[PDB]
Amino acid sequence: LGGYMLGSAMSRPMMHFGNDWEDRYYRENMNRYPNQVYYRPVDQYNNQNNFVHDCVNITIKQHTVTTTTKGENFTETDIKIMERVVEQMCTTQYQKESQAYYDG
């Protein structure tokens, strides 16, 4: 890949975009969707959003390719779904991996 690691699968998180059409598309397709996240160690970072930018990138990059070959067809919609859940889970796993950096 280049140096990334699938952290965990989120257990159908239940979250809000702020939208309706997005909210629903997650909770109708989340079973098919990438609901895990790939990352580097937080060990060469200090902030969430930029690690998270790498994180959601490699997540979706692997998945979009692989899942397509397995049979799938995401859209800029399914993307903005994935991209949301995966970014909030990337940021949240940074919090987890940071707790584990400190190891509390």
From Swiss-Prot:
It comes from the Eukaryota. Residues 1-104 are annotated as: PrP27-30 (protease resistant core). Glycans are attached at N57, N73. Disulfide bonds join C55-C90. It is found in: Cell membrane; Golgi apparatus. Belongs to the prion family. It is linked to Found in high quantity in the brain of humans and animals infected with degenerative neurological diseases such as kuru, Creutzfeldt-Jakob disease (CJD), Gerstmann-Straussler syndrome (GSS), scrapie, bovine spongiform encephalopathy (BSE), transmissible mink encephalopathy (TME), etc. Its primary physiological function is unclear. May play a role in neuronal development and synaptic plasticity. May be required for neuronal myelin sheath maintenance. May promote myelin homeostasis through acting as an agonist for ADGRG6 receptor. May play a role in iron uptake and iron homeostasis. Soluble oligomers are toxic to cultured neuroblastoma cells and induce apoptosis (in vitro). Association with GPC1 (via its heparan sulfate chains) targets PRNP to lipid rafts. Also provides Cu(2+) or Zn(2+) for the ascorbate-mediated GPC1 deaminase degradation of its heparan sulfate side chains. Monomer and homodimer. Has a tendency to aggregate into amyloid fibrils containing a cross-beta spine, formed by a steric zipper of superposed beta-strands. Soluble oligomers may represent an intermediate stage on the path to fibril formation. Copper binding may promote oligomerization. Interacts with GRB2, APP, ERI3/PRNPIP and SYN1. Mislocalized cytosolically exposed PrP interacts with MGRN1; this interaction alters MGRN1 subcellular location and causes lysosomal enlargement. Interacts with APP. Interacts with KIAA1191. Interacts with ADGRG6. The normal, monomeric form has a mainly alpha-helical structure. The disease-associated, protease-resistant form forms amyloid fibrils containing a cross-beta spine, formed by a steric zipper of superposed beta-strands. Disease mutations may favor intermolecular contacts via short beta strands, and may thereby trigger oligomerization. Contains an N-terminal region composed of octamer repeats. At low copper concentrations, the sidechains of His residues from three or four repeats contribute to the binding of a single copper ion. Alternatively, a copper ion can be bound by interaction with the sidechain and backbone amide nitrogen of a single His residue. The observed copper binding stoichiometry suggests that two repeat regions cooperate to stabilize the binding of a single copper ion. At higher copper concentrations, each octamer can bind one copper ion by interactions with the His sidechain and Gly backbone atoms. This is Major prion protein. It comes from Mesocricetus auratus (Golden hamster). The gene is PRNP. The chain holds residues 125 to 228 of 254 of the full protein.
